[PDB]
Amino acid sequence: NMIQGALELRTKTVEDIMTQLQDCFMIRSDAILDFNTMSEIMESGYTRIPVFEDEQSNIVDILYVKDLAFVDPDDCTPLKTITRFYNHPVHFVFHDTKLDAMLEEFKKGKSHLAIVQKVNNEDPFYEVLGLVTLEDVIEEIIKSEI
Amino acid sequence: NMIQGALELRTKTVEDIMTQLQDCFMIRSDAILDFNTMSEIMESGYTRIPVFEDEQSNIVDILYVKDLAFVDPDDCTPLKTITRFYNHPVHFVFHDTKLDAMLEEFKKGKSHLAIVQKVNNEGDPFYEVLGLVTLEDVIEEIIK
């Protein structure tokens, strides 16, 4: 039993865990932080929000919502200021990657949020299927062993 | 790797993971939101701050720092107004609770900060507040 849960964990990929891109809450890099955008970001509940340029599949920066604390919606400062400030390293991963290697990347200090990419032959280009995070990994651990 | 994470997940008690109370960053519930207060909350780096009344051991509320988005410090807004307005839940947990079980409690939708309680027989017995443990604390203790 412990064996089956263990290797069933070890056999999953990020594709099988990751929240799908269409169910993720993202934000356009051009966006300005006004009461509507701000309120939306809060109401979303996500602590880390992807910031993408143009097409949804190209993710430039990452927004930590605690950083919106002092932003006043009356100043209407664009999120572009914030993301162009940070330039957090974006974390990319192959869709076939096993969870143990993922846990290695997280142990080495990489961003706890990671973006799932697959080579699309349909020249081949890299498409973004969605997002997986360390919390999803550990969730799979404690779920699958029981 | 996965095995190491699961095993360390089921051995460690939240007491081992926890941040002691004396070293916590808390805020009194009567505090007001002027520049020193907001600047302190910002430089603390905590995303969820415990809110207490009288002694530090009595933790009445929780402040999600992101709420503070809609406050301005020139208003001198009482933290009591915010705490009464959102009414966020406080989470208590037994000092013997294993880490994975704690992940189950947080996963149920409870606040991602949890207060660790011990039973104290040493002088009528009472429940004792040792500190707090956060979901982030748990995950960090898995990757180390």
From Swiss-Prot, chain B:
Looking at the record, which disorder is this protein connected with? Jalili syndrome: A syndrome characterized by the association of cone-rod dystrophy and amelogenesis imperfecta.
**What range of the parent protein does this fragment cover?**
360 to 505 of 775
Q: Where is the CBS domain?
A: 18-79, 86-144
From the UniProt record, report the name of the gene that encodes this protein: CNNM4
- Which subcellular locations apply to this protein? Cell membrane
Q: Which family does it belong to?
A: Belongs to the ACDP family.
- Designated name of the protein: Metal transporter CNNM4
Kindly list the organism's lineage: Eukaryota, Metazoa, Chordata, Craniata, Vertebrata
Q: Where is the signal peptide?
A: none
Please, what other remarks does the record include?
Shares weak sequence similarity with the cyclin family, explaining its name. However, it has no cyclin-like function in vivo.
How does this polypeptide assemble, per the annotation? Interacts with COX11.
* Tissue note: Widely expressed. Highly expressed in heart.
Function text = Probable metal transporter. The interaction with the metal ion chaperone COX11 suggests that it may play a role in sensory neuron functions. May play a role in biomineralization and retinal function.
Question: Which species?
Answer: Homo sapiens
